[PDB]
Amino acid sequence: NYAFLHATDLLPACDGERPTLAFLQDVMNILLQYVVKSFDRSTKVIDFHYPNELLQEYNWELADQPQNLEEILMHCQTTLKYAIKTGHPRYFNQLSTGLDMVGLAADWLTSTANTNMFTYEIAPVFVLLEYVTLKKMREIIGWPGGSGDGIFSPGGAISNMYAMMIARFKMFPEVKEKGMAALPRLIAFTSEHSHFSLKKGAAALGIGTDSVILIKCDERGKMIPSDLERRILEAKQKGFVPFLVSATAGTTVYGAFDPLLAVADICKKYKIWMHVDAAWGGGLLMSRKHKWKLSGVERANSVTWNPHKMMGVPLQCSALLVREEGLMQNCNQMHDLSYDTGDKALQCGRHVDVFKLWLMWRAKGTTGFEAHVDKCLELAEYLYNIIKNREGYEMVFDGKPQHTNVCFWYIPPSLRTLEERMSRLSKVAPVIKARMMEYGTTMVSYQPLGDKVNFFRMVISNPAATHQDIDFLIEEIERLGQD
Amino acid sequence: NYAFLHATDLLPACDGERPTLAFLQDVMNILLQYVVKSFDRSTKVIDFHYPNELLQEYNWELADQPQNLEEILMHCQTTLKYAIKTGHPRYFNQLSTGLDMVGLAADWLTSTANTNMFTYEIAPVFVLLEYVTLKKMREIIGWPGGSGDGIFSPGGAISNMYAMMIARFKMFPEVKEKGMAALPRLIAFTSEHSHFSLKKGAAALGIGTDSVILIKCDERGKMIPSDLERRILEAKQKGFVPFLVSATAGTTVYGAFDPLLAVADICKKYKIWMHVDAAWGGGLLMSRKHKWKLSGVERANSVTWNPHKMMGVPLQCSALLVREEGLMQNCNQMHDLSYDTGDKALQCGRHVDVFKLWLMWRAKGTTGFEAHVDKCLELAEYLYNIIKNREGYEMVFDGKPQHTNVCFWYIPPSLRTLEERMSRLSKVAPVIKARMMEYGTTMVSYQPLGDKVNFFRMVISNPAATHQDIDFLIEEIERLGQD
C-alpha cells in the first residue's frame, strides 16, 4: 500500500478514489486513537523536549522530491506524539483547555467545505449561521431583541483592535480619509489588570501606547471607578479627547470583573464609548447563577467574547458585538446584497468559525453551556476552599475567585517559618513547573504581577477535569516542591 | 443509537468511548461521501437558494434545550448539501479553488491537536515547522541562505497590513509610543490594479486613504514606473514623506505583475521600503519556468504570499516575509525563549496553519508544487488560445495572460454586428452568471474594471480542472448566452 503510493495517486487522480478513502481513513484512525488517549489519565499531558532535542529527534526539514504516503502517515503519528494533550483532564496551562467532540466534528466538516466567508454566494449556509449565532449572543448580552451588529474575528486581540477602530471612527469619521493627523489627541482608558491587546491595538492604529492610560485597580483586581474619572478629567483639562474606555469582564490572571455599572455611568457622563473585553468572562453570561458578574454589559457600545475559551469551541472563535447597526460597514467599507458583509471587517479572506459554535450550541443547547460554565466554576471553588485552608498554600490576594482563576503560592516545608524569603519563593513556581513538564503529569501557568512574585495561576475550563484532578494537582505540587 | 444519545453522553463522559468512536466515524463517513462527490462531474457545483429560501428550507435557529445526536448528524448532512463544492472541477469563482487530500488530512489533525501558536511550551512541533517552512519560503524568494524573518497571518490582507505597520515603524520607531501625530505626513504608493487591503490597512493604521496614492497602469495591468517616480517627487516637493511602495506580483483581476526590478530601483533611489503583494502571484515562485515574472522580489523589504491560493493549502495559509531580522519583534513587542514569537504579531491567540502547508510540502516536494503551478498555467493558456480565436469572444486587454487569470466578454449572437451595444454587453455576464448558478453547472466571477464593463474573470488554481472542463465552460457560456 502506502509505501508505493504518493499524493499524485490520490483524488483528483482518476485511479484515486480507493487509495483516497483508505488514506483519509488511516489518518482518522490515528486521530481517534489520540482522542481516546487524551482522556486517559495514564497518558502524559506533555512529552517534553528542548527545541534542539526535538529538531535532532526527527527530520522536520523540507525537500525537493516527494515522500510516499507511509512516510506521510508517520509524520502525522510523530506530530501527535509530541503535541501537548490540550484536552487532557490535567492540562491547566491556558485559558483555552479541552477537546469538545461535537466541536471537533464541526471543525472537520468546516475544513471539508473549505470556503471563504466574504459572500453569501460561496458560503450561503455559513453566512446565515453567522447572522443567527451573533444575534443570539447579542440577546444573551442584553441588547433588546438581539439588536446590533457583529463579526467573528481571528482572536479577541483583533476584536479589541476592531472595537478601538470603530470607537475612533464613530467620534471622528474623517480619520478614515485623513488619518490621525487630522484629529485632536485621543485618549483611551483601561485597567492595570487588562489585556495587552489594547496597548498593541493603539500602537497599530497610530494612536500611541502613550495615549492608553492605565487605571488603578483594587486588591481584588478591579478597576477603581474614581481613578477613571480622575484620569478622564485630567485628559480634558489638557484639552485631550477621551474616546474610549475599555472595561475587562474577567481578567487573564485574577479573573477579576470591572464594575460595569459604574464605568457605564462614567461613560454616560463624559459621552465616551464603552467597550467590554469579555474574551474570558463572556462564558459566565450563559450562567443564570453567575451572569450578575457582568451586570452593566447591556450598556456597552461594544463587547468582545471568545467562545473558544470558556465555551470550549475549538480554537479561533472570537466575536465582536457592536450595538449600533451600520457602524462597522461604514467604518470598514472603501466604497440581496445585505448578506455581504465582506466590507464589514479588515480581513478579506476569512475562515469559517461559526459552524463549530453553532453545531455545539445545537448539540448542547443554551442550558448545556450553562451547566458546563457552572461545573468549571464550582471546581475552582473546590480548589479555592482546599488551598485556602491548606498548610503551605497562601492566596495571592484576599477575596474569593470571580471566575475559575485561582492564584496562589506554594511555600515548600523548607520556607514556611523563615524570618525576605520572598526571593526564594520567587523561584519555587519556575522549578515546580519545570518538574511538571519533565514528568508530564500536569501543566499550570505561573507569573508575577505588580508587586507579587512568581505565583501559580490555576484556571479551569476543561469539561474533562474532575474533583480527583484537582486533588491530584494539590498533591503533585507538594511532591515536586522539594525544594 | 443516535436518537437516544446526546453530547453529554460522549467523551469526556465515563460511558463515552464507544458512542464517541461511532459518532466521529459517522461524521467522517458523511465527509468522505461529500469528498468523492466533489470530484464527480455529474455533481452540481452549487445547489442555489436565495437567503430567504434557505432560511425557510431548514430550521437554523438556536434553542435552550439540547438536540440528540441523530439531529446533529442531519445538521452536518444538510450543511454539506447546500455548501458550494469548492473542490469541483468546474468551480472557477475565486482565486482559492480545490480540495487537497493531504491538506485536508493535515487540517483534520491540526483541529485534533487544538493548540495555540504563541509559545514552544504548548506548540513545540508547530513552532519548529513554522521556522523551517518560512525559511524555505525565504530561500525560494531569493534571500541569501533563507535569511530574514516571517509570520503566518490570518489573511494576506492582514499580512499587507503588517508590512505597512513595519515599514512605518522602521522609518519612525517613535510612532509606537507617540502615534501618527508625532510624524510627518506619510505617503504610500500602489498600483491602480492593486488589492484594496492597502487602502483598508492605511485607514486602520491611522495613515488615511488620502495618503495612499494610486500609480497609473498600462493596458496590460502593470504599474508605470515613471508615474511612480513622478508621484514620489511630488510628495517630497510638498514636504510629504514617502515611506512605502507596494508592488503587486499577480493582480486579482488581470493577473498582472508589476515590474519589480524598476520599482526596486526607484525604492533604492528614494530610500523607501519595497513591499511585494505576492498573495496570488507567489505560487509562480515554485516554477522554474514561470518565476521570472517575479524577478526583483529578492530586492524587496517584505513579501506577502498566500499558499492557500495557488499552492492549494486549505483556507488560511498566508505568510508575511520580512528581510530584516528582529524588526517584527521590535515593532510588535510591548515590553530558550527564541521560540516565542508571541510578541512578533498583532494576534495573541493564533491558529496553527503551518502543518497543512508543511505536510503537503512533504507529500508533494517542491517539484510537486512546481508541476501543479505549471499545470494550471498551461490550462489558462489552453483557454486563452481557444477564446482568442473563437467567434463571440473578445479579450478585455491585449497581451497574453501572466497568470491563470483570463479576462473576456462573451458577445451573444444577437449583439456581434450591432452598430453603444456596450450597454447591452454590460448586462450579459450578470445574466449568464445567474443562469450558471440556477443550473449549478459551473461558477465564474465577472466584474467591471475602470472603463471596461462587466467581463468574466476566469481563473485556474484547482488540480481537478482538466482540458474537458475548459471545453465544457466555453460551451456552457454559449448555451446560456441567449440573450
Q: Which residues are CB-neighbours of A451 under 8 A, at least 6 positions away?
A: none
Element (H, E) at B318: strand B318-322
Question: Dihedral through CA A272, CA A278, CA A279, CA A280, nearest 10?
Answer: 150
3 state DSSP class of B413: coil
B12 → closest Cβ in A39, A129, A179: A39
Residues of chain A with Cβ-Cβ distance to B351 below 8 Å are 154, 315-316, 351
CA distances from A326 to A167, A299, A339 (A): 13, 18, 13
Q: Cell 488560445: give the residue.
A: B385
Alpha-carbon distance of B75 to B68, in angstroms, equals 11
Q: Would you say how long chain A is, in residues?
A: 483
Domains along chain B?
A: 1-114+353-483 (3.90.1150.170), 115-352 (3.40.640.10)
Residues of chain B with Cβ-Cβ distance to A39 below 8 Å are 11-12, 16-17
DSSP readout, A445-483? EEEEETTEEEEEEE----TT--HHHHHHHHHHHHHH---
* Nearest partner of B379 among B436, B446, B309, B461, judged by Cα: B461
> Strands A443-449 and A406-410, how do they pair?
unpaired
Alpha-carbon distance of A192 to B145, in angstroms, equals 44
Report whether B278 contacts B303 (CB < 8 A).
yes
Q: Is the dihedral of CA A154, B46, B427, B444 positive or negative?
A: positive
A349 → closest Cβ in B27, B107, B316: B316
3 state DSSP class of A246: strand
Cβ of B204 and A165 within 8 Å?
yes
Q: Is the dihedral of CA B40, B460, B316, B340 positive or negative?
A: positive
Between vectors from CA B303 to CA B301 and to CA B304, what angle results, nearest 5°?
150
Cα nearest neighbour of A348 on chain B: B157
Element (H, E) at B361: helix B354-388
CA distances from B36 to A199, B33, B437 (A): 48, 5, 21
Chain B contact present for A37, CB below 8 A: no
Q: What resolution, expressed in A, was reported for this entry?
A: 2.3
Residue of A17, A72, A111 to mutate, testing the B interface (most B Cβ within 10 Å of its Cβ): A111
Chain A contact present for B292, CB below 8 A: no
Chain B contact present for A63, CB below 8 A: yes
Between vectors from CA B40 to CA B481 and to CA A76, what angle results, nearest 5°?
130
A96 assigned to a ligand binding site: yes
Alpha-carbon distance of B375 to A462, in angstroms, equals 47
Helix axes B101-113, A101-113, angle to 10 degrees: 160
Q: After which residues is chain B broken (C to N over 2.5 A)?
A: 335, 419
Chain B contact present for A280, CB below 8 A: no
Report whether B7 contacts A368 (CB < 8 A).
yes
Question: Dihedral through CA A31, CA A37, CA A43, CA A45, nearest 10?
Answer: 50
| Alpha helices per DSSP H over A91-245 | 101-113, 124-141, 156-171, 175-178, 197-204, 225-237
Q: Which residues are CB-neighbours of B230 under 8 A, at least 6 positions away?
A: none
Q: Which residues are CB-neighbours of B175 under 8 A, at least 6 positions away?
A: A203, A206, A208, B168, B169, B182, B183
Q: Three cell numbers at A276?
A: 467590554
Residues of chain B with Cβ-Cβ distance to A12 below 8 Å are 39, 87, 89, 463-464
Chain B contact present for A79, CB below 8 A: yes
Report whether B463 contacts B38 (CB < 8 A).
no
Q: Is the dihedral of CA A106, A107, A112, A113 positive or negative?
A: positive
Element (H, E) at B250: none
Q: Three cell numbers at B45?
A: 457545483
Residues of chain B with Cβ-Cβ distance to A446 below 8 Å are none
Report whether A388 contacts A368 (CB < 8 A).
no
A10 → closest Cβ in B23, B101, B155: B101
Looking at chain A from residue 214 to 233, which residues have their Cβ under 8 Å from any Cβ of chain B?
A: none
Tell me the technique behind this structure.
X-ray
CA distances from A114 to A224, A351, A355, B35, B346 (A): 47, 8, 12, 11, 25
Cβ of A24 and B32 within 8 Å?
yes
Alpha-carbon distance of A192 to A194, in angstroms, equals 6
Q: Three cell numbers at A278?
A: 469579555
Residues of chain A with Cβ-Cβ distance to B336 below 8 Å are 50-52
* Nearest partner of B174 among A190, A242, A181, A210, judged by Cα: A210
A457 assigned to a ligand binding site: yes
3 state DSSP class of B163: helix
Cβ of B115 and A197 within 8 Å?
no
Element (H, E) at A298: none
Chain B contact present for A94, CB below 8 A: yes
Q: Would you say how long chain B is, in residues?
A: 483
Chain A contact present for B175, CB below 8 A: yes
